[PDB]
Design a protein around this ligand. Sequence first.
Ligand code: HEM
Ligand code: HEM
Ligand SMILES: Fc1cccc(CCCNCc2ccnc(-n3ccnc3)n2)c1
Ligand SMILES: Fc1cccc(CCCNCc2ccnc(-n3ccnc3)n2)c1
Ligand SMILES: C[C@H](O)[C@H](O)[C@H]1CNc2nc(N)[nH]c(=O)c2N1
Ligand SMILES: C[C@H](O)[C@H](O)[C@H]1CNc2nc(N)[nH]c(=O)c2N1
Ligand SMILES: [Zn+2]
Lengths: 407, 411
Amino acid sequence: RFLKVKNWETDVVLTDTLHLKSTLETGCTEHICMGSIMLPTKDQLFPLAKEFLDQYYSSIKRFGSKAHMDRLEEVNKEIESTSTYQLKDTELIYGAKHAWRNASRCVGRIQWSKLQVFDARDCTTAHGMFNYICNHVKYATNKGNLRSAITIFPQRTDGKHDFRVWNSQLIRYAGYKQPDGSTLGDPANVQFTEICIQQGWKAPRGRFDVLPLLLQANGNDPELFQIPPELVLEVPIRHPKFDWFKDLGLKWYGLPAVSNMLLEIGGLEFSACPFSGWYMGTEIGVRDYCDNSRYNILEEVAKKMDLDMRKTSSLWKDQALVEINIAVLYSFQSDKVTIVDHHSATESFIKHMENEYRCRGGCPADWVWIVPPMSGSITPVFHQEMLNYRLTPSFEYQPDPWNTHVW
Amino acid sequence: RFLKVKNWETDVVLTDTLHLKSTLETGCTEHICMGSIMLPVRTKDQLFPLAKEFLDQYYSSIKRFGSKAHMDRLEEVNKEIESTSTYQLKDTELIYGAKHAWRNASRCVGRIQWSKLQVFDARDCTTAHGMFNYICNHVKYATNKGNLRSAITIFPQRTDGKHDFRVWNSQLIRYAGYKQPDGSTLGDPANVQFTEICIQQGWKAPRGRFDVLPLLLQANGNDPELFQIPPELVLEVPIRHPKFDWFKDLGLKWYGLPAVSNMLLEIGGLEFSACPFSGWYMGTEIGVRDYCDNSRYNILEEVAKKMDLDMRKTSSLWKDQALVEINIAVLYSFQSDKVTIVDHHSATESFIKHMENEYRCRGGCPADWVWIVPPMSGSITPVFHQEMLNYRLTPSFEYQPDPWNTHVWKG
Ligand code: HEM
Ligand code: HEM
Ligand SMILES: Fc1cccc(CCCNCc2ccnc(-n3ccnc3)n2)c1
Ligand SMILES: Fc1cccc(CCCNCc2ccnc(-n3ccnc3)n2)c1
Ligand SMILES: C[C@H](O)[C@H](O)[C@H]1CNc2nc(N)[nH]c(=O)c2N1
Ligand SMILES: C[C@H](O)[C@H](O)[C@H]1CNc2nc(N)[nH]c(=O)c2N1
Ligand SMILES: [Zn+2]
């Protein structure tokens, strides 16, 4: 019931008690750990509401107060008659920040409390959704000095009138499969691209074509909009030593913005709730560029560096990997766009973990996702034991809309 | 209940039925995953189920299940337990046992090799001098002049837990660490505690950076005793770099034989508290962990200095840059001296092939992702992208408290 976590590099030991408030289930049992699986009513709703308001009022040191009880009273009256309820602005802001505080896979949470929340609960059409999105984009980008943000569309009601952004990120490159057999652009988005096309996009069939938003308001069929090109800040990728690197033709976008998740606050589900912060270098250099089923550029880069590609034991992949990643960080920094390296970012998260241990009594964390996908054991998080559990409010995954949407 | 795992790079889906035979706990619940936590005298009562269980598997594997030979063996072990309270394994069962414990070891990336394991039965051993002699033969046979061979040596099982055989070293071969009065450490910081024990026990420490430690051996519950492995039996490799000539001048070497001496082998309820096993190194255990952990030799600084990297800001990735070089140097040194070693690309690829095979033949392969994924270049190895189920099968290797915490001193 009172669990310990040890850092094997510093012997610091922390006691986790927050896990005792674990609301949701893990996937794991005593018989089987699922630690590495990517994805494992009026009655229901009032307890969720109560648990949330309870934390809310606790956080502002008004727990058990007249104002606390009146709010419970009030939400309760509202569910009873209306079968749902609405969050006070303040509660919505606290909900969103805590959804982020609680994301056990996010290395960037030392930042959790400076989230800028944009309430779009008055939005009613896709055209409004488009407008709210562009403002989020522009506000967050901030000419390269990026700032965290979330934009929250109306909550689910009867599930026939959902708001959804069909893109998985606000900004992503398209993907086109050739007769030639291979793939042009991002193989991650091949399917979504086809939906853009079957829904009418005029794709320019290039390697780095920013996708159009496919927006769905109030259960309606989704509609297409291009993001003002001038709002999509991009970085050309150069190397500070290899002059030939620029010839590889590589750019990435500055603004990482997840748009397919579902935000759950005290029982309510915001199914369109795009959020954004800023990149840790490896996300692009290691994952986007080098994943075999992504841009997969390792072999091309290794060749330019003239490494012995005959045998895996030369570590040519490893050499190239490092250079690619130096070139990402370098390019963002030169163009003055916010980026964090995996050393600095994992070290922040260790400071953050202790804070949270000390102030909250814990910090749910998923080691499989927090350890960077290169140089693992030389970042501190590698030596850090982590307990993973599910707290609410939370961001959750949800099925891709082309499987659910009744046309 | 079927369970599916997915590879996110290739889209292969596998189906695990094996986890259905899992008995031991994991440390997780529906409300907590302890997947990144390093760590989680037996009655008649418990013992027969565990024996029966094991012997049904043994007999299945040899296609003799339900044979007269199967029945009689149950019969025999049965009587033996309630009369002597324990029992003795046949040779073939001990072998099968040892093999399966490796096969079941979810944190071992080397398991494609599980069926080629040389088992040495030291169950007739009775003294520490006998243990030393057994261990020497193991080192020499496994080393095989650099052409390394997997092996394990099995000392007698626990009885009342007052008579245990233990190897006090955590590995048969490892380097001394010496904390200095100024606060620094000479040699391997990981072994400072054990080193002090050895000194206290009578070892004259040379006090250099790469001093092979004396074996410290306990037989039959007795206080343990110091022996030096004959240096001629200890294969070592000097570390140099194919292109950097200043690399040799760092003074690095490592030993060739990775040999775990501190674990507990459980087979049909029997506990073998001394059971050193050895394979061959994946390059990263040395290049990444031993050399580059901050809590170990911690050489990144000095290596990056010599490559004259920009060390003023971590976003140079000078750490990552030195790290590749060191690992290249290790793989190159070993290969050049014809001492067996495997790089992490090659090791993880073989492991994926093993794991698929296991699903097809055995209906599963328990695997610990946190441990299987290498500690550099995680995502450019195919294991990163592999979903794994982790669960505990017997026979298995278990952890056990360090013997100096538990041993009753005789005097
Ligand atoms: C401030 C800079 C931020 C950094 C450096 C950062 C870093 C990361 C990283 C590296 C991951 C793993 C994602 C991957 O490998 O695809 C991640 C996941 C995540 N982050 Fe962040 N993050 C930041 C901001 C935010 C914000 C503003 C939110 C929400 C308001 C958020 C919520 C999450 C969630 C929910 C995940 C898990 C996503 C999933 O399961 O696919 N993060 N973060
Ligand atoms: C044949 C060559 C082998 C290779 C390349 C290999 C590779 C590895 C590696 C890299 C680890 C993680 C090491 C660490 O980080 O401490 C490991 C762990 C392990 N291996 Fe092997 N292994 C081999 C042979 C064996 C053998 C012969 C056995 C037993 C018969 C074995 C049983 C284990 C066990 C039980 C662990 C887990 C150790 C722990 O929990 O501390 N391996 N193996
Ligand atoms: F194919 C998949 C199915 C489900 C999850 C997956 C991994 C999530 C990848 N997206 C996470 C992501 C992407 C960009 N940016 C962020 N981000 C930005 C700030 N914090 C997180 N996060 C792949
Ligand atoms: F400080 C610690 C406490 C508990 C475990 C730890 C790491 C396990 C290190 N031993 C694993 C190891 C070492 C050498 N060789 C092998 N090996 C050989 C074959 N299979 C594994 N394994 C550190
Ligand atoms: C199978 C495994 O769960 C999967 O590859 C995970 C591993 N760790 C990860 N870690 C991060 N940060 N992001 C990811 O997408 C993944 N993928
Ligand atoms: C806390 C964490 O579990 C610990 O650092 C683990 C992580 N993965 C590992 N993986 C291997 N192979 N060996 C290790 O010692 C560790 N250490
Ligand atoms: Zn688990």
